Amino acid sequence: VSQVRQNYHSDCEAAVNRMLNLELYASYTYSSMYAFFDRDDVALHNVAEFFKEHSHEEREHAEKFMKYQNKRGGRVVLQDIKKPERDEWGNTLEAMQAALQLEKTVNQALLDLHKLATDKVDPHLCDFLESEYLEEQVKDIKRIGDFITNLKRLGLPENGMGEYLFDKHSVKES
Amino acid sequence: VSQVRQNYHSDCEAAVNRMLNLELYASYTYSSMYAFFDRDDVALHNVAEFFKEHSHEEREHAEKFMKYQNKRGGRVVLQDIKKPERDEWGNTLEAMQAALQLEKTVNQALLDLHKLATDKVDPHLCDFLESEYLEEQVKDIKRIGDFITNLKRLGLPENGMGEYLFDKHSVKES
Amino acid sequence: VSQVRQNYHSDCEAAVNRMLNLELYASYTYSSMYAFFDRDDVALHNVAEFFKEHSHEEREHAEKFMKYQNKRGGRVVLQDIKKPERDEWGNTLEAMQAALQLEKTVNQALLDLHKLATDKVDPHLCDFLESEYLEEQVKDIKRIGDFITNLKRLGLPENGMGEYLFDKHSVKES
Amino acid sequence: VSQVRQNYHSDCEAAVNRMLNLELYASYTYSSMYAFFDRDDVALHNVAEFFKEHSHEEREHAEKFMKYQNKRGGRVVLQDIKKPERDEWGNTLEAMQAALQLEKTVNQALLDLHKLATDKVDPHLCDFLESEYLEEQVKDIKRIGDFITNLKRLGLPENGMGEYLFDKHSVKES
Ligand SMILES: [Cl-]
Ligand SMILES: [Cl-]
Ligand SMILES: [Cl-]
Ligand SMILES: [Cl-]
Ligand SMILES: [Cl-]
Ligand SMILES: [Cl-]
Ligand SMILES: [Cl-]
Ligand SMILES: [Cl-]
Ligand SMILES: [Cl-]
Ligand SMILES: [Cl-]
Ligand SMILES: [Cl-]
Ligand SMILES: [Cl-]
Ligand SMILES: [Cl-]
Ligand SMILES: [Cl-]
Ligand SMILES: [Cl-]
Ligand SMILES: [Cl-]
Ligand SMILES: [Cl-]
Ligand SMILES: [Cl-]
Ligand SMILES: [Cl-]
Ligand SMILES: [Cl-]
Ligand SMILES: [Cl-]
Ligand SMILES: [Cl-]
Ligand SMILES: [Cl-]
Ligand SMILES: [Cl-]
Ligand SMILES: [Cl-]
Ligand SMILES: [Cl-]
Ligand SMILES: [Cl-]
Ligand SMILES: [Cl-]
Ligand SMILES: [Cl-]
Ligand SMILES: [Cl-]
Ligand SMILES: [Cl-]
Ligand SMILES: [Cl-]
Ligand SMILES: [Cl-]
Ligand SMILES: [Cl-]
Ligand SMILES: [Cl-]
Ligand SMILES: [Cl-]
Ligand SMILES: [Cl-]
Ligand SMILES: [Cl-]
Ligand SMILES: [Cl-]
Ligand SMILES: [Cl-]
Ligand SMILES: [Cl-]
Ligand SMILES: [Cl-]
Ligand SMILES: [Fe+2]
Ligand SMILES: [Fe+2]
Ligand SMILES: [Fe+2]
Ligand SMILES: [Fe+2]
Ligand SMILES: [Fe+2]
Ligand SMILES: [Fe+2]
Ligand SMILES: [Fe+2]
Ligand SMILES: [Fe+2]
Ligand SMILES: [Fe+2]
Ligand SMILES: [Mg+2]
Ligand SMILES: [Mg+2]
Ligand SMILES: [Mg+2]
Ligand SMILES: [Mg+2]
Ligand SMILES: [Mg+2]
Ligand SMILES: [Mg+2]
Ligand SMILES: [Mg+2]
Ligand SMILES: [Mg+2]
Ligand SMILES: [Mg+2]
Ligand SMILES: [Mg+2]
Ligand SMILES: [Mg+2]
Ligand SMILES: [Mg+2]
Ligand SMILES: [Mg+2]
Ligand SMILES: [Mg+2]
Ligand SMILES: [Mg+2]
Ligand SMILES: [Mg+2]
Ligand SMILES: [Mg+2]
Ligand SMILES: [Mg+2]
Ligand SMILES: [Mg+2]
Ligand SMILES: [Mg+2]
Ligand SMILES: [Mg+2]
Ligand SMILES: [Mg+2]
Ligand SMILES: [Mg+2]
Ligand SMILES: [Mg+2]
Ligand SMILES: [Mg+2]
Ligand SMILES: [Mg+2]
Ligand SMILES: [Mg+2]
Ligand SMILES: [Mg+2]
Ligand SMILES: [Mg+2]
Ligand SMILES: [Mg+2]
Ligand SMILES: [Mg+2]
Ligand SMILES: [Mg+2]
Ligand SMILES: [Mg+2]
Ligand SMILES: [Mg+2]
Ligand SMILES: [Mg+2]
């Protein structure tokens, strides 16, 4: 047993490792989207930079779980980071739709971890999730939903001018 | 009788209370428009912020009538603030059309109050309306009319790209 | 269904709308208190400004619920804002007593919303209430209770000198 | 006829001269109040300074009428400035009551001048009164009424401690 361990259930420790893997998976998916939008035959560089920055965010999310695990006296156990579901992402609308689904998948895993922490009466883990993960998740989901609404308004997928305009006005210029 | 009261007719006092209520009603309508444009399936955030700021303006307009009432020795009497006419506002053009009508309704009430103040020979109240309300009303009506002309030019309601562009270029970025 | 909606029960959505209305109601009550203490025959201007600032706080509380509703994919539904219970507020002690009761009513509604969110297993909503509402509520209740104790010490309602002194020393000079 | 004169009725010219005299009379009354509160057996120096500053205000009000008269091509005609109604002013409450009555007398004369200017179709004179006199009059009347309410609350005339406290907290320290 770790000398620091107190009120930390084995099931929660394992679920934190799984959650860490999922954050790394999400990071990798966003990296793939970055590379796609940087292609010379796609060439939407503000969209590309948006996904690059989200990839970095998710890796920070993973590292925070590593630190958490050690703070509680659990042990980090790593697994393969699965490659993303797709090799090419279609266009800005398809990518944003995939990002929305990914963020909801991550959110569901966080909510499931909260239910486990609640069942094991671990208020520190509940607070960690509520204070460091759940709200930023809701914010990201809202932002991406707002983008999807605007991409549809702009006539995606068919309206190339609309897609061009989204890249200039909706995402930060990089 | 209030010790400060001088040349302040009961009818004017009552009309000031009614006008206060109408300003609060206008504020509430604009709040509703803000919330609508902030919806994830609407997502025109500069339009939303435009309406939020107008909601704050109208509440300031109401508070100025409260202060006026007390300065003259009248007594503030509040009534329910009626909910807005609609729960959803269609799109930027429909909302701006409703805003134009609302500002003209408020203007008509101000003009009617001026006619009452004139009939009761209350130059202080006439000056207050002319100096604090009537010109800003004309300016707001002109601004909203200009917006409606541009929304029609941009092909509203059908042209989603036009609506997107209005939000980026016509209203302040928030 | 909203594309962003996840783990957000219809009952919670409705309760958030009701809570929004209650915040607006509280704002309006405080506005009435402001106007009362600004009367020439009341004339306690620091007390008036205290209530004006609380009125603004409560409207900010309402707007935060609007934003919350949209972030979760719920839909803002507005109802009439009922006029305050009284047209005149007696004196500083009676007003502070009414304010204490109002803040406890608002607190009870927040606590009831927390119980609903708990029952529906909505940790995001629980966190929102705990992080943005519950503590500031306890602070406001404590502050008003402290004021009531001091108003009684100062001999309210009978001791006009005491009431005058409270306005100079207990509330911020405006 | 003056070369500048246009749309300026003889009756208005005469009424402006009378109004000038009344402003000078008001100034002189306030000077008397200043001197009274500076007496060693009265000794309320912030109250004294309040009245001194109002005396200066009223003399500025008179000089503005002189300038107005000349701008319109009328001719300033001066009369004796009558000494104030009283040689001694009792206490802060009695003085403030007399000041309220004086400000209402001045206000009534301004309103009567506005009615004359209206009857003679002189919009410049109406605007001058509305823009330079009527609102500041309402503000002064409200301020003095508020003071009277507080002096009564403080137990004037009998409560000397109350009178002392008013001088420290209600009027600017000089
Ligand atoms: Cl343990
Ligand atoms: Cl334990
Ligand atoms: Cl265990
Ligand atoms: Cl594991
Ligand atoms: Cl596998
Ligand atoms: Cl693929
Ligand atoms: Cl597509
Ligand atoms: Cl997914
Ligand atoms: Cl968070
Ligand atoms: Cl641009
Ligand atoms: Cl956008
Ligand atoms: Cl009257
Ligand atoms: Cl009159
Ligand atoms: Cl009347
Ligand atoms: Cl009324
Ligand atoms: Cl009704
Ligand atoms: Cl509707
Ligand atoms: Cl339309
Ligand atoms: Cl309307
Ligand atoms: Cl104006
Ligand atoms: Cl425009
Ligand atoms: Cl849901
Ligand atoms: Cl869930
Ligand atoms: Cl549901
Ligand atoms: Cl509802
Ligand atoms: Cl009802
Ligand atoms: Cl009442
Ligand atoms: Cl009481
Ligand atoms: Cl209550
Ligand atoms: Cl809080
Ligand atoms: Cl002090
Ligand atoms: Cl206190
Ligand atoms: Cl002439
Ligand atoms: Cl003419
Ligand atoms: Cl003439
Ligand atoms: Cl003359
Ligand atoms: Cl004489
Ligand atoms: Cl005398
Ligand atoms: Cl007396
Ligand atoms: Cl007089
Ligand atoms: Cl003025
Ligand atoms: Cl005072
Ligand atoms: Fe993440
Ligand atoms: Fe994410
Ligand atoms: Fe542009
Ligand atoms: Fe308004
Ligand atoms: Fe308006
Ligand atoms: Fe509140
Ligand atoms: Fe409150
Ligand atoms: Fe004057
Ligand atoms: Fe005066
Ligand atoms: Mg060991
Ligand atoms: Mg284990
Ligand atoms: Mg996994
Ligand atoms: Mg594989
Ligand atoms: Mg909890
Ligand atoms: Mg917390
Ligand atoms: Mg937080
Ligand atoms: Mg985030
Ligand atoms: Mg996240
Ligand atoms: Mg946004
Ligand atoms: Mg009275
Ligand atoms: Mg009446
Ligand atoms: Mg009405
Ligand atoms: Mg109704
Ligand atoms: Mg007329
Ligand atoms: Mg103007
Ligand atoms: Mg305006
Ligand atoms: Mg207006
Ligand atoms: Mg313009
Ligand atoms: Mg949809
Ligand atoms: Mg529902
Ligand atoms: Mg309710
Ligand atoms: Mg009712
Ligand atoms: Mg906190
Ligand atoms: Mg608070
Ligand atoms: Mg609160
Ligand atoms: Mg305290
Ligand atoms: Mg000549
Ligand atoms: Mg003449
Ligand atoms: Mg005279
Ligand atoms: Mg004489
Ligand atoms: Mg003015
Ligand atoms: Mg003045
Ligand atoms: Mg004056
Ligand atoms: Mg004041």
Swiss-Prot record, chains A, B, C, D:
GO terms for biological process: intracellular iron ion homeostasis; iron ion transport. Gene3D superfamilies: 1.20.1260.10. Belongs to the ferritin family. Fe cation 1 binds at residues 23, 58, 61. Its EC number is 1.16.3.1. Pfam families: Ferritin (PF00210). It catalyses: 4 Fe(2+) + O2 + 4 H(+) = 4 Fe(3+) + 2 H2O. It comes from Aquarana catesbeiana. Stores iron in a soluble, non-toxic, readily available form. Important for iron homeostasis. Has ferroxidase activity. Iron is taken up in the ferrous form and deposited as ferric hydroxides after oxidation. There are three types of ferritin subunits in amphibia: L, M and H chains. M and H chains are fast mineralizing; the L chain is very slow mineralizing. Fe cation 2 binds at residues 58, 103, 137, 140. Oligomer of 24 subunits. The functional molecule is roughly spherical and contains a central cavity into which the polymeric mineral iron core is deposited. GO terms for molecular function: ferric iron binding; ferrous iron binding; ferroxidase activity. SUPFAM superfamilies: Ferritin-like (SSF47240). The keyword Amino-acid biosynthesis does not apply. Disulfide bonds: none annotated. This is Ferritin, middle subunit. InterPro entries: Ferritin, Ferritin-like, Ferritin-like_diiron, Ferritin-like_SF, Ferritin_CS, Ferritin_DPS_dom. It comes from the Eukaryota. The lineage of its organism: Eukaryota, Metazoa, Chordata, Craniata, Vertebrata.
